[PDB]
Design an enzyme around this catalytic site. Structure first.
Site, PDB file in Angstrom:
ATOM      1  N   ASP A  44       6.949  15.924  13.282  1.00  0.00           N
ATOM      2  CA  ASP A  44       6.704  15.757  11.859  1.00  0.00           C
ATOM      3  C   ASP A  44       5.202  15.824  11.578  1.00  0.00           C
ATOM      4  OD1 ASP A  44       7.471  15.586   9.252  1.00  0.00           O
ATOM      5  OD2 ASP A  44       7.701  13.424   9.205  1.00  0.00           O
ATOM      6  N   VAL A  84       5.486  -0.793   2.596  1.00  0.00           N
ATOM      7  CA  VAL A  84       4.460  -0.915   3.629  1.00  0.00           C
ATOM      8  C   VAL A  84       3.358  -1.838   3.131  1.00  0.00           C
ATOM      9  CG1 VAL A  84       2.741   0.298   4.938  1.00  0.00           C
ATOM     10  CG2 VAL A  84       4.948   1.359   4.563  1.00  0.00           C
ATOM     11  N   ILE A  87       0.804  -1.222   0.000  1.00  0.00           N
ATOM     12  CA  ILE A  87       0.000   0.000   0.000  1.00  0.00           C
ATOM     13  C   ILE A  87       0.835   1.269   0.000  1.00  0.00           C
ATOM     14  CG2 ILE A  87      -2.080  -1.044   1.015  1.00  0.00           C
ATOM     15  CD1 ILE A  87      -1.043   0.081   3.779  1.00  0.00           C
ATOM     16  N   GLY A  88       2.129   1.198   0.279  1.00  0.00           N
ATOM     17  CA  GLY A  88       2.909   2.421   0.322  1.00  0.00           C
ATOM     18  C   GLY A  88       4.382   2.102   0.397  1.00  0.00           C
TER      19      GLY A  88
END
Ligand SMILES: [Cl-]
Lengths: 348, 13
Positions: free
Chosen positions: A147, A36, A28-29
Site C-alpha cells: 500500500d 487516531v 488527529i485522523g
C-alpha cells in the site's frame, strides 16, 4: 491536564510489560477501526500517534508481528502496544503506539501543486531515495508493504527525514502461495493487481514508488481513475498497449482480452520539458509492465538520479545537513551486497 | 484531497 496510564509492551527489545503514562490526547485522523489520537508520553515528552486495529482471536496480528521485527531510520518506529475496548461494542482492539511525525509527502506535494509550483528536485531525490531504502529493508525480509502511496510517507519537513508507515496491508510473500489481489490504493496499483493477479511479488511496491516519483515530477498523479478500466487507459496512453508476452508476465488469464490499441507516448513528452532527464530515465525503469524488469529498491538507490545525494557537499536548501543516507546494514544490502560501492561513497 | 491528518502546516484544502 488528564494523565492516562496503561500497561503496555515495548515495541522492540524487552517483552516485559511496563506502566506507561500519557497526556494531552487529541484526535488527529480517522482509521478503519477507530479514530487516531496524538498523545504526549509523560516520561519523555515525546509525541506519539495511537491507532486501533481489530484483534483476530484466531490469528496473531500481522501488522504487529511485522512492526516488532523492523528497525530502520526510514520506517516509523513502534514504541508500545496494548489492547483495549473501542468503537464497536464487545470487540477487542490492538493499539499501536507509534512515534509521531507531523507531515507527509502528500501534504508537501499538494502544497506545491496548488501553488502551481514544481517541488524542488533535491527534495524529490531525498524523498524517493529514502523510500527506496525502506523498501530494500522490508523486501530483504520477504515483506511487501502492498500500500505504497504519498499519504503513507511521513515527513519531518525541516530535516527532510522520511519514514514509511501503515503496515496494515503488509505481508511476507512466499512464491507459490497465493495472495489477495485487492490490496494497494487507487492511482498506485501495479497493472498485475488491476488484472487481479494472486501471484505477484514485492515488485508491486516498486510500481507504486514509480507512481509517487511521477506524481512529484508532474504535480498530479500520473495514472488517475476511479475504476481499474479508467486507470488502465491512463497507463496504456503512456506505456502503450501491453504485448501478449507482457500480459502473460502480469496475469496470463488476461492475454486474450480486447485492450485499447495505443502506441506508447514518448517518455520525454510525459513530463514537462525541464524535468531532469535522469528522473525520467529512472521513472521508465520503475513503470514497466513486466514485473521482473522493474528495478529492485537497492538498484533504484544506486541509480544516477541519486548521485547528487552522494556528493560530499550537498546540503538542504535551508542550509541543514542531509539526513542519514549511508548507514546500510548487512540485512539491508543482502539482495545485492556490492551495490555498496555506489551506495556508500568514500566520504561515508 | 485525501489527507492522513486533520491539520498541516502546509495549509488546508
Ligand atoms: Cl497526507
Amino acid at each position: 491536564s488528564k494523565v492516562t496510564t496503561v500497561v503496555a509492551t515495548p515495541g522492540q527489545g524487552p517483552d516485559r510489560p511496563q506502566e506507561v503514562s500519557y497526556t494531552d490526547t487529541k484526535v488527529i485522523g480517522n482509521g478503519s477501526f477507530g479514530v487516531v489520537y496524538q498523545a504526549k508520553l509523560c516520561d519523555s515528552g515525546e509525541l506519539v500517534a495511537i491507532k486501533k486495529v481489530l484483534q483476530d482471536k484466531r490469528f496473531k496480528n500481522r501488522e504487529l508481528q511485522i512492526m516488532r521485527k523492523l528497525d530502520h531510520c526510514n520506517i516509523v518506529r513502534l514504541r508500545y502496544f496494548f489492547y483495549s475496548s473501542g468503537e464497536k461494542k464487545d470487540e477487542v482492539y490492538l493499539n499501536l503506539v507509534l512515534d509521531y511525525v507531523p507531515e507527509t509527502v502528500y501534504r508537501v506535494a499538494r502544497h506545491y501543486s496548488r501553488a502551481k509550483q514544481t517541488l524542488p528536485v533535491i527534495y524529490v531525490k531525498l524523498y524517493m531515495y529514502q523510500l527506496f531504502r525502506s523498501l530494500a529493508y522490508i523486501h530483504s525480509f520477504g515483506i511487501c508493504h502492498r500500500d505504497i502511496k504519498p499519504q503513507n510517507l511521513l515527513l519531518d519537513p525541516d530535516t527532510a527525514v522520511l519514514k514509511l508507515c501503515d503496515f496494515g496491508s503488509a505481508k511476507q510473500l512466499v512464491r507459490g502461495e497465493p495472495n489477495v489481489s485487492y490490496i494497494c490504493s487507487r492511482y498506485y496499483r501495479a497493472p498485475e493487481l488491476i488484472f487481479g493477479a494472486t501471484d505477484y511479488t514485492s515488485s508491486i511496491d516498486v510500481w507504486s514508488a514509480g507512481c509517487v516519483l511521477a506524481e512529484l515530477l508532474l504535480g498530479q498523479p500520473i495514472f488517475p481513475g476511479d475504476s481499474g478500466v479508467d486507470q488502465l487507459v491512463e497507463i496504456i496512453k503512456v506505456l502503450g498497449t501491453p504485448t501478449r508476452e507482457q500480459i502473460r508476465e502480469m496475469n496470463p488469464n488476461y492475454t486474450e482480452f480486447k485492450f485499447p490499441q495505443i502506441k506508447a507516448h514518448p517518455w520525454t513528452k510525459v513530463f514537462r520539458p525541464r524535468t531532469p532527464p535522469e528522473a525520467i530515465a529512472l521513472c521508465s525503469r520503475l513503470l514497466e509492465y513486466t514485473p521482473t524488469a522493474r528495478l529492485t529498491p537497492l538498484e533504484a538507490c544506486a541509480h544516477s538520479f541519486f548521485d547528487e545525494l552522494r556528493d560530499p557537499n550537498v546540503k538542504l536548501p535551508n542550509g541543514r545537513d542531509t539526513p542519514a543516507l549511508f548507514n546500510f546494514t548487512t540485512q539491508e544490502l543482502s539482495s545485492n551486497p556490492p551495490l555498496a560501492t555506489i551506495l556508500i561513497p568514500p566520504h561515508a | 484531497x485525501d489527507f492522513r491528518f486533520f491539520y498541516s502546516r502546509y495549509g488546508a484544502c
